[PDB]
Amino acid sequence: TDALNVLLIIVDDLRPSLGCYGDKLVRSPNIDQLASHSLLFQNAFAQQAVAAPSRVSFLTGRRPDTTRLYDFNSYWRVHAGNFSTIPQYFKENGYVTMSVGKVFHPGISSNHTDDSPYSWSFPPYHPSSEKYENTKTCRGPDGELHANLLCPVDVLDVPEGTLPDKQSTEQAIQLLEKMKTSASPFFLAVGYHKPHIPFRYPKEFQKLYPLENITLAPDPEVPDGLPPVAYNPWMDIRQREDVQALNISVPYGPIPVDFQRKIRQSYFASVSYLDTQVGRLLSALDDLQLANSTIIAFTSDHGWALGEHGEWAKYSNFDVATHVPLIFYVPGRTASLPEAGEKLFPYLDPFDSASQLMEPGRQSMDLVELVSLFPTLAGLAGLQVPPRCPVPSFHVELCREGKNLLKHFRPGNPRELIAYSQYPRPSDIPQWNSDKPSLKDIKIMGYSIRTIDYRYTVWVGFNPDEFLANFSDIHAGELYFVDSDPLQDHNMYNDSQGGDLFQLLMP
Amino acid sequence: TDALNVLLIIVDDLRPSLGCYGDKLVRSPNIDQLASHSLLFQNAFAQQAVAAPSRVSFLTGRRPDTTRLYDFNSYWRVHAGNFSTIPQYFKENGYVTMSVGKVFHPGISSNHTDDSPYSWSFPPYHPSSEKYENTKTCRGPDGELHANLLCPVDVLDVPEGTLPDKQSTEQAIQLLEKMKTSASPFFLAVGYHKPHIPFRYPKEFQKLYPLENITLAPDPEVPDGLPPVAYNPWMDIRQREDVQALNISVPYGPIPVDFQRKIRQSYFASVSYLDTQVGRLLSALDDLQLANSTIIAFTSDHGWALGEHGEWAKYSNFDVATHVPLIFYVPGRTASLPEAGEKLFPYLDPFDSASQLMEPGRQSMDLVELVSLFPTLAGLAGLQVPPRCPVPSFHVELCREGKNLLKHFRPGNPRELIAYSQYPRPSDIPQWNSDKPSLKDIKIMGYSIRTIDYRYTVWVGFNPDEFLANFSDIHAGELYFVDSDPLQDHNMYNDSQGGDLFQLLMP
Numbered sequence A, B: 001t002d003a004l005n006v007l008l009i010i011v012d013d014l015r016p017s018l019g020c021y022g023d024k025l026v027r028s029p030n031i032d033q034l035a036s037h038s039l040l041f042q043n044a045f046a047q048q049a050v051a052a053p054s055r056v057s058f059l060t061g062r063r064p065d066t067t068r069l070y071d072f073n074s075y076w077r078v079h080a081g082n083f084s085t086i087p088q089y090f091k092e093n094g095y096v097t098m099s100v101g102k103v104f105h106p107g108i109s110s111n112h113t114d115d116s117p118y119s120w121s122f123p124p125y126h127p128s129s130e131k132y133e134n135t136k137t138c139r140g141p142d143g144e145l146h147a148n149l150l151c152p153v154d155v156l157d158v159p160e161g162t163l164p165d166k167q168s169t170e171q172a173i174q175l176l177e178k179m180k181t182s183a184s185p186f187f188l189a190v191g192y193h194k195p196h197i198p199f200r201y202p203k204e205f206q207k208l209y210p211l212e213n214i215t216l217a218p219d220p221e222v223p224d225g226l227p228p229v230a231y232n233p234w235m236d237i238r239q240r241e242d243v244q245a246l247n248i249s250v251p252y253g254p255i256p257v258d259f260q261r262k263i264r265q266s267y268f269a270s271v272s273y274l275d276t277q278v279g280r281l282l283s284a285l286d287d288l289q290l291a292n293s294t295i296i297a298f299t300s301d302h303g304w305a306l307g308e309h310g311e312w313a314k315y316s317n318f319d320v321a322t323h324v325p326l327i328f329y330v331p332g333r334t335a336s337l338p339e340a341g342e343k344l345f346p347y348l349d350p351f352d353s354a355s356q357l358m359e360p361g362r363q364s365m366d367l368v369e370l371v372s373l374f375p376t377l378a379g380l381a382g383l384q385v386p387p388r389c390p391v392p393s394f395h396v397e398l399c400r401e402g403k404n405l406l407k408h409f410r411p412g413n414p415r416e417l418i419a420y421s422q423y424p425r426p427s428d429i430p431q432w433n434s435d436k437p438s439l440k441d442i443k444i445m446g447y448s449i450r451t452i453d454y455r456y457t458v459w460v461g462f463n464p465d466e467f468l469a470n471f472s473d474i475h476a477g478e479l480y481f482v483d484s485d486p487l488q489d490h491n492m493y494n495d496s497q498g499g500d501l502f503q504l505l506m507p
Ligand SMILES: *[C@@H]1O[C@H](CO[C@@H]2O[C@@H](C)[C@@H](O)[C@@H](O)[C@@H]2O)[C@@H](O[C@@H]2O[C@H](CO)[C@@H](O)[C@H](O)[C@H]2NC(C)=O)[C@H](O)[C@H]1NC(C)=O
Pocket: A082, A084, A117, A118, A397, A398
């Protein structure tokens, strides 16, 4: 009897545009193969659709209103409370805990040291080539180098001759090889960068998605019923040279159709590129015979809009921005243990037109939240599940605000039917800082309820000095029905009275 | 080590107009003395403010939408499911279970046998003199007999020379004396009739409340903001001779001021009369030395309006109609065990101007529901608490839809902050059957949420054939704030958006 290892894979800005989530266009064979042996959650949502707030949230197991982190300019241990993290908890239980890539958000939100010395057994590894993502590293048709958003590259024509996710994969494999020697179990967090912007990927992956076979989003127009307060102006992508040359109006655009399809091409190519890296990582896990002793959690910190509602990027409460993939492989529970010389995660080449997305593994339609990642991994690994947090929990160091999802591997509280998301705004009209408002400039907080049936959102007055929401100062509301309006194009909040919330509360 | 006895006292139509609930006018010294040794719940509410629906609810531990009993014309075991009752459960655990007075509602709702043979050890006792309550038994100033609503009587001038609650008290005492012999513990349910109409009580109690020192209700007018659908026309009291002679308009009245004060006099007198009966019962319990081995639960099936909002009687979702008293005496837990020859419930005479309401015993402001009576008594008595019901539970015989209140004797689910009530209507405009609509005539169901902060009610379309509420067909709504509008005179539903419900759902 031993304790199970944990491989936590985090992808930056990855929406569930994956074969195992019903996407019949994107080629993600390696991730789909992971799902075939795993429990896949169809309705998992981040608590805020932006990096640091989401990562600090699900790494401490607390919600944004407990971390009080809505931008990226505060360290929770000083700002809110001495909250323990997932890797800190495993390390305190005899694990060797290791970080590769973007797990914590860099900077002050992790005290510039990836939350040292609490979380990790040694100073994390961050790939060097990431610092060239936003340099003049994209060679164009006429031979010059540019800082482009769409950046298919020959690896032999970029600085250091590599890409950050290839480095992370390589380093993760070496650490896996090392841990096969150690007597201690490992908790390995690998944080991949793509498909986060810019879309810098080996140019060969672009051939998987010719533009002729690329369509726009189903709902590229800005909906009439979308209140301006809920719109994010996607300002960061406007700074890239190729985007800047199109002279796209602020804040509503639209992006020219031809470039919209090019964005979707490069995003899809980056996903398939990401998928091969995951393939290499999981394949090495198989070769090392760790598949029967290692939990594998695969998820993302938030989604990314690709033209839906005339929106791009995250910074939103729409499903496209909050819906994330969430897959859990548990040796001998989500699948039969691998027998003699059996391989569960053999590398699959997206350039091979074969098979049929494999079969969908276990699936769950329950509404779940990233803030449940902490208790789930602690339970799946055989450790003590931290207790439920009181309200408030600024003074508690080890507790969880999310539910454990272990029951899903074999009394109806209404909150178990809800995935919560939120996002701040500095004003009602989209302006320069509406994507990523700093704490002092937040004046509105949009709180959103997502059920199997609808998304209910209210944009309410917010006081950043007292961290106080005023649910009597509702600036605007949104109500989208999954059955009739899955794309969320027809806001029904004005025609509503609140009977949907009453119904949810009524036993 | 032994099991504790249970004395469950139920009062028909008793609102918390009691000294131990802050009423500085009504004299209820014996009940207040029970409270001084008990845990008193300040915010307990029935699930529907009318007899059979409420009694079948809290006796089976299920809600009205599980019993599907909204009138008094169906037996749950045939109509909904083979639901077990509190006394049935105790009897199955070696208790002698006994019923005196109105515990179950008589008629088909209890199969005309008080739910025989499941609930009781022998056919219950019902006082004979109750059948004279609605006869010409009230002697008037000119010497004739009338069927009056206000019925102060000399006991020597009524049929059989007694009153139903005196008989019940006497019979309960005899059963207590008998059980002091038995080796088995007892579960004794005593159901008192007054202050249910008519107000027939020993006329001496009328002297405790001279009319000069009687005021009207604080809010005797019908509020402008009260939707007609939520108004009950109080038709039953209009049939009494003294009421009929005033020629009170239907359905809004008002009742003449002088008669309003007379109603309140007779109600208060009936409460003090009830209190002495409780005094006799509890005093006999003390004399028999059962105070250290007997749980005592005191409550009511619902309230009664005394002019608030121009309303009278129950059939309502207002606090006055749904708020009930709820007191739990637990030997050695809510108070120190009685030592040698100590008496905890000595009879107190309301005609003695002495003391000062005693001291308030333990108190709890948590919002609780009568449907929690089943699990609480089962726990307090040392028995296994039935499990929480699934949804739906028509097929389950033993389970509870309410929470156990044992924690109150030494994760925040929003439903633990709510007491639920409801009431049906046959139409929006008050009509002949708006007080007590029969199932087939129900077209609207008013669902109400009560928190520490507000009461939120929606009157929605209801289909009695499918037992289906349509929360998209809201006929009207109500929102009353406890802090600013404790009397519930200023409906704020039209100025509201639903942010109060959202706030309750948001962790
Ligand atoms: C913040 O907490 C860390 C570690 O918390 C540990 O785990 C918690 C679940 C709880 O059990 C704590 O009591 C644990 O200490 C603190 O780091 C410890 O600091 C003490 C002295 O300050 C030191 O002796 C320990 O070795 C440290 N342990 C670790 C794992 O680093 C830290 O001090 C806390 N910070 C504040 C400001 O309270």
